[model samples]
Target: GLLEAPTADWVHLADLYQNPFPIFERLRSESPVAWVPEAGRYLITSYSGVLAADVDQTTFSANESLMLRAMGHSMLRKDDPDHQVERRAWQPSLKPGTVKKVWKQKFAENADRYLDAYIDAGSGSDFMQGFAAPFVAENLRALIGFENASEADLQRWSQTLIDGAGNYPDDPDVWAKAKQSSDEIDAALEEMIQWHSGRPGDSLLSYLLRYQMPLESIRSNIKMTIGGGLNEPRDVLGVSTLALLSSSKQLELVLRDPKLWGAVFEESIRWVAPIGMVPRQTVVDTELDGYFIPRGAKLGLCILSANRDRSVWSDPDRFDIERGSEAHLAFGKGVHVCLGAWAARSQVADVGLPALFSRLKGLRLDPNQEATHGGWVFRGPLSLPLVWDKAVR
Candidate 1:
């Protein structure tokens, strides 16, 4: 086993979970592309390096990555035509142009309902539990044909399955839950297929059912949709809210402009991106950012690192909502960019944040108790404890 590097013993993922930014900066400066024995992949740490690898589809094939197989052949892992087919099939619903009208109104309503439920709970609230989780779960209820599924089940299955997806399949408990979640999801999907296959409707699941694809394939994508998209906005909401309220200046900007919430969402994720590292594999012998590689080398494009590249972002560590820039790769770039990227940010900026401010009435984090985030792969708040004025101002 080789110790990976630009720094001493820092490439260990445990070290990564503890604090990756400093080491990532070191890698960006010294070894932007380095090998990790544990990951069995070359870590690409710089913005340009990662962007170069992500867009060069011929050299770095998503289809050959572990995530592709783990995701059960969803469009995120496919290349070219197959990717186009799966992506195009759902493009209308997820694309930036038309999805707003389809979801914005209802998304706002859903946010209202969730925040109302949060207030109903009490002044001191577990934002992740009372609001963020259900907001995303209920929002996707019909889209994935899980309308009848309880919010608890939706959250459970979504988190467990997401925890198991990606790489690092070493945890028995995670894998066990992943299998369990898959089984339960399949059973639920079987029911949805029976219902939607015979009678297609506006629900995205129904649209997918109409296609003559395997039931497993639909199940895979739906689980991916639930797991991938659900937690993003949920975590983003909690993390971004805490970031904003902690700084009076930042919070004031958003309240005055409202539009700055877009930068809030982008910069929040850029600072602490929800999906940390998206994986890829080499299709043929190649090199990236001057690093030598061969066919079959696994590579990880560090979204968190790329977003904070010192050269590209001024004062990269600061969380400034009024940055007025949206070039960050928090969502991603090129062919396999997140399908729901637009919806994720749109819900946060247009719907999620507005609902929180209006309903919560000067929402602020619990000062005594810490509002913090965790996770190495899918990062976000484990719990966000908050309080707000009851007056509807």
Candidate 2:
């Protein structure tokens, strides 16, 4: 006989948005897999449960309706052959080799450009808006072959699509913005595709054109990339900067060996995963951690919780870059793992953070203002007021 998963009446969507860790802790302690009516999905908080659901794709389908509505059947919302085809088409541009050869220099240049502006803006600056966001937007625009689009344009599109995708509340206003952005992107793609077809090169749009993938898919996947790419790297830069600044011991270690910036990047994401929960739907009747999950039930695989699972990592809440090389599911697992992981690491760890710390001396959070954060599905520092010692010119 199958048993129903525990129902959590206390879990509200607002709490998940504001501060989810306490709620996740309770859920993990009481019922690792529990149904929340407010969220309209089963929240899987345990490491083992999330891993099981992530790897076992047959039972947990990725064809989520929200993503489909927002991104229009992009690779992230597909399964197996369909997903693999789109992923393979897009992989060449983002692979470690391609990123190193093509985008690494671009990443460094963008970092320097932004750092110059941030420095000129003086010591008391909002790092998130002033530096991280524009730097990431530019990097993504270059990779996606949207050379004609401004950084502000890309940022607007990314945010609108994300809002629509995460519109669990079914807000029509959100859809209106997402639809407008989608139309704007589609209009731009017409010119972009025509331009890339004649001059095919290293950009993701060029690769998709080479593969002769459907125009619709190319549009959707590019939109999906734009939606997924911009925020995580931006958030990681802010979160990692704050994490390093808050701990002198950790900051001193990184300053001693710049190589440890890699560890710092990994640990920052582990501590506060930017894209927190991954959405899935049940393909058939299944059970996770001994709890029955009926077919068609929506699921939120809480990778944020899994990253902090006490069973998997020692002192999980602490920000420790020296926590060894244990892997975290922040990039997720299985075939659907993040496609832009290499690009993100190169941009932040290799280029962005190094440039900022080396150029800006005595960098620390602005004592006058406090940092704020929100979102459960997509989470990170919303505003990071930072101050650093300006060079005497």
Candidate 3:
């Protein structure tokens, strides 16, 4: 008996290590629900296929304890009853209605402060390092009720922790360092939790204390939120910047109607979602689009592939700001959808990028620098060397 060669191109780790889009699209076309021998699991490549797996949490479990070890037992890997309860605890503060009141003014203020400083600092700057990173880090600080920390320090710690959690499975050396960061970050956060528990207030930490959650679980969820939130909004904003600059026509249209920044942001996520693939594990034998997946098999929901599914998205590769408003799986799907989506959309699209457009009249990418998307699991502009004339305040 002969095993057929793996139809999916991303079966190789090297494919996943670099640009996986061509391989992702290839899998979607040749094998929407094919098994990858290298990964020892099936890859869900089509939009419909990915959605089917995502929405059915009962069959496809998210609890990969080994992979999520650094993240704690947060909502990222919870199943129904537990997921529902844990999600309910934090839903109130995260609700769309409250996000506006809680963050609208705060985000605007932060946006202005970052833009003002960047403009004053110089004409040429790396928005990734100077503005987006720090701005998002400080915003995370404010949202979680921490204060007076260097944005650089927090950003470094957040990135280290996320890398540690996300990469441990791939390498022994990486796992060792990840554990060190995990221990340090967890210890610091646990101490912060205790300090806040005594004087619980308007912060998320304070709100969760009322539920009397297990000390470890509470810390875990908080860490998950902070750790994930650190990279995404910043990346999305970077995506939007790169998209708008790459297209003069789109840039003109957006500048004419600054309000369209939201639409551009939406399209940006659709065009090149920051998340490459979301991990899931099967609890029972299942058939998806006629492909059999056994119990306990790991799966990578190819988010980038799904976003580019030709059946769902017409001219899926074209970056069109005028495209119809359809739901994108960038934030994910079903019960475990990114909980902080409302915050991300609100803070980054509605306020931050729009604010940037209004304040930096002639912002353009610096031709002298290289600006391209990077990362295997997480994807975004590596460095957007932006040059903008100071706008009249």
Candidate 4:
């Protein structure tokens, strides 16, 4: 039973506390399926396992976000119409086919204003804490009709996410704290939803306001969009930064070639997938790659590992800006594919590459500072302190 993996239990989460991926790799190569006693369920490892889980949501649940089915704040439901309806609600604002194109000028203005401030703020800054974090927070704010969201309020939510899983093992009172944040964030969105109704405009929140949807529906979706948007900046910046920092050559080439932003984004996604685990619940008994997988297992597609699965990709681990990364699974597959993919790619490329190229002229990490890594759910660096000429503006 050397290949036999331990069943997921409190130990798995505890092991996850240390690091999640390496263990996942071992499980993938060793035991692809395991039973965890804690939840009285099983863990599905390997690329195929995660994919199978993602594809079968009928029996698998994406609704884990909600405490009670009756309350209805869930991400995964069996209903395709349910998922599509919620997804469609925000599609107009997200897609370039409509609102994004209209908001092009505004998006650019936000981009420039952010880079300007970040560039001026210059040295001795935590890129995560200062620039990368605020840029997305502010952009989401503008998009969601939160004009009055002070720099402090934006930072609260922004930092709250990158705060690194809230010290893990979350207190015995984890539910209380989580519920409070969910509620506080909900109330804030409700206030803005009303504000949108009174002063209707062409913003994401305003779109929700125009519909006259149920109060709960408006609060929940808008709440998620804004939450997702806030978390997104850190995700994009973290992954993209990891890509550039991993290779000085890639960094320099992009500085010279502004046109390569799209490629850079694809490369980044292929490099360090921002999502920790795209969860999938199984349906009907299934077998993948000689492994026996039964119904109702929790499969967390190891995106970072899958992004580099040697069977599917060549030179999977190496950082290559020039490589074709279309095959990458950093974004999920099938019906559950990331809805924000285009917006994410666009945001990262439009702001990230150009800003790094234009601002840092000759950006290089400080040799003295210790570079620390961060986030298992969404991986990247704790800080990237570069030592460039202070003389340049």
Candidate 5:
């Protein structure tokens, strides 16, 4: 016999989308694992609860239907064995060795390319538009072996796919836009596959082709990569930029000891994880945080909420770069942890932020305009207006 999980009927979908932190705090305090009727799933908020659920794939399955429909049955939606096959296929290009040997320089070059544009845009430029988005998108385009697709195309496709994947309300228009993007990616893959087949290289698409993965797997995985890749890294860059600008003391600390850039990136993500909630399905009846969860139940592992669990961190809401070496579930855990985590760290901590700070002397948020942030599921700085003393030439 087990106790019923607490109910959170007041959790509105709009509120969750607009600003979910308040809601998450209340849920974590009251019931770490609760059945949210509005979300049609169990919302797990505690760090311990989410960590347990994330790694225990036998108890909680990743065969989530929403993601499957949105981005096809890519590795992200599969449990082990099946998941490992596709993951191994894509791993070589993203491994730390490959990232350092091949992609690191490219990431630096991409950052410099956009920093040039950002500098030309002058003081009071929107960092999100002028730098963050395009830089992340272009790197993704190169990594995915889509030389023909522009940064704008990758950005558009990623957003549409993300919208469809998170369309819990089942919006018709969202699905339509996602479908169109998917079609566009498939068409582009036709040429990409052929081109890469003849000239295999370090790109992910080329790796998949070289490994002789099925065409459908290649297509879905590429679409899934495009969908999942762009937003998180872009948002992290934007969020980290704003975080550093806002905290002058912390900025000075990192600037003085450049090694702390890694801590800055980690703290920013821990402060506001870009991919907030991940979907999971209960494989069998289970008990979590003393609450009964039925078999075949859907759950939203609130990584954002878990990252701020009061029990896990002292003053959890505050962004402290020197915060102790406690691990966070921002990039998730276990087998399903983000494959691009290394790439993202390299691009931002190693290349992007350093380049921005060095190039834009006296870089700080624009005084005339305020930064705006939105989305709980895929949250980030929508606008980051900034002004700098001078462009270091």
Candidate 6:
């Protein structure tokens, strides 16, 4: 019953709700890779190993694919070609070139539609809930065929079902939230599938239905679309907010030139990597890091710790806005790499930040308001309160 790197690397996840990076840095330095016999898991905390596992997806398996199977929705987890088929249907929503056709110039409105609520000039308001959250959610809605799904209900769904713990076998709260929210999502998809039954919208879900999947397959695919994309950014948003709040100079820079938001988003994701650790069940017996993990052992290839490894990242603790390392595995690697990485990047950089900056140009800390962040599977601001700017000029 080894405690592993409990206090140091595991930050809050050892006890609290959020996964902390400060402690992760220590774990990365002390035990780059180790076996956690107590948690009934094998842990990998180095960049090389994590990257290797990400590339080895057949063995690691994606979350939805596994969960769908457990929940009797295994139809989507059949294997490569079918998994590829479903992912392909959602790719165009933000694959850069294809996004133009998918978004159909609504891309231009992405910044505008949200900024319209802003009153401040250079002095802006609290842009997170006011702008960023909505922006990412809207972008996701468009991509997932849930675009027309009621925004209020969808937001409520995301908030309630943040961890997708809706499928948790033990926790009643997790299951309750998940069931309620997933029900809404299912209803929305059902309605969208029906409405777009013969007539489709510009979003990806519409296109997916166009494949004419069976009712069951289409419903399962809708759930998979979520585990595939939308859930991660909520994590990105929380972790991103933590990074921004922790650094004053960086936030000031964002206040001055919204152009830096792209860098901010990337660096924040790299620094915190909301999807900090990915769990891989060994398809076969394997030896890793001086430990033999039997087949079916859950190996957590920790992306957060890998991103923080000192040997790879000099001064790994500090936030360097201009750092040229998009190489971080915030979004897994290989076939299991996030299908919505582009979409998430777009939402964070182009779509999410612009909306926030436009309204709250001079967002600063409301010290009285504290950031309550946690959840191992996901991390982000529970609520961020910044002093809202009243005037720009």
TM-score of each: 0.91, 0.97, 0.91, 0.83, 0.96, 0.81
* lDDT by residue (tens digit), candidate 4, 1-393: 124345645335556544656666666666666665643445565566566566655655564423221223533332475776766666656675543575545656666777667677775556665567766766667666776566457656544433322434444445454455556666776577657775646677766556345667665565455445666556667667656766888877876887777788887777666666555556666655465656665555556666666566677677787766876777777666766666666667875556555666555566677556655456666676654454222
Query: Judged by TM-score, which candidate is best?
Result: 2
In candidate 2 the C-alpha lDDT for residue 75 amounts to 84
Residues 1-393, candidate 3, lDDT per residue (tens digit)?
Answer: 323324454378676667778878778777788777766667888888789999999898888645466556787778988888888887766678878887777888888888888887666788887688878878877777664345665686677667767663567767676566667666766666667776846566657765457767776777687678878889988988888888999888887887787788778888888776888898897867667777887888878778888898789888888874388888888898887888888888888887887778688888888686676567888888888876743
Q: Least lDDT summed over 10 consecutive residues: which range in candidate 6?
A: 1-10
Error of 5 at 135 (Å): 0.2
- Write down the RMSD of all candidates, one decimal each: 3.1, 1.5, 2.8, 3.9, 1.5, 4.5
Query: Can you write out model 6's per-residue Cα lDDT over 1-393, one digit (the tens) per residue?
Result: 323333233333364244456555555666655555433456678887788767765665544222543223523345476667656665555576666454634544655665554343222234456555565566667676664575455566665554443343456666666677667766777677667656646566655656546666666656655554554675565556556767787777777887787787778777767676666677776655444556676777778778787777777677777563568888777765666666676666666555554545455667776656665455556665556555331
For model 1, residues 1-393, the per-residue Cα lDDT tens digits are: 222333234578777876778878888888988887777778888898789988888888887643443456677777897777777666556767545767777677788777777778987778888788888777767445575587678888877877677446568787777778778877887777777766845667766665366665677777778778777878888888888877999888877888777888888898888988888888887777766777888888988888889888788888986564367887788877788877787778888887788777767788876776566566788888888777351
- The TM-score of predicted model 4 comes to 0.83
> Which one is best on lDDT?
2
Instruction: Choose 2 or 6, whichever is better by lDDT.
Output: 2
Clashing pairs in 2: none
Which pairs clash in model 3? none
Candidate 2: how many backbone clashes? 0
| TM-score preference between candidates 2 and 6, better one | 2
Model 6: CA > 4 A from native:
1-13, 16-19, 62-66, 69-79, 100-128, 159-169, 234-260, 391-393
Which pairs of residues clash in candidate 1, taking residues 3 or more apart in a chain or in different chains?
A: none
* lDDT, each prediction: 0.76, 0.89, 0.76, 0.60, 0.88, 0.60
Displacement of the residue 67 alpha carbon in candidate 5, Å: 2.5
Candidate 1 vs candidate 4: which has greater TM-score?
Answer: 1
The deviation in Å at residue 253 for candidate 4 is 3.5
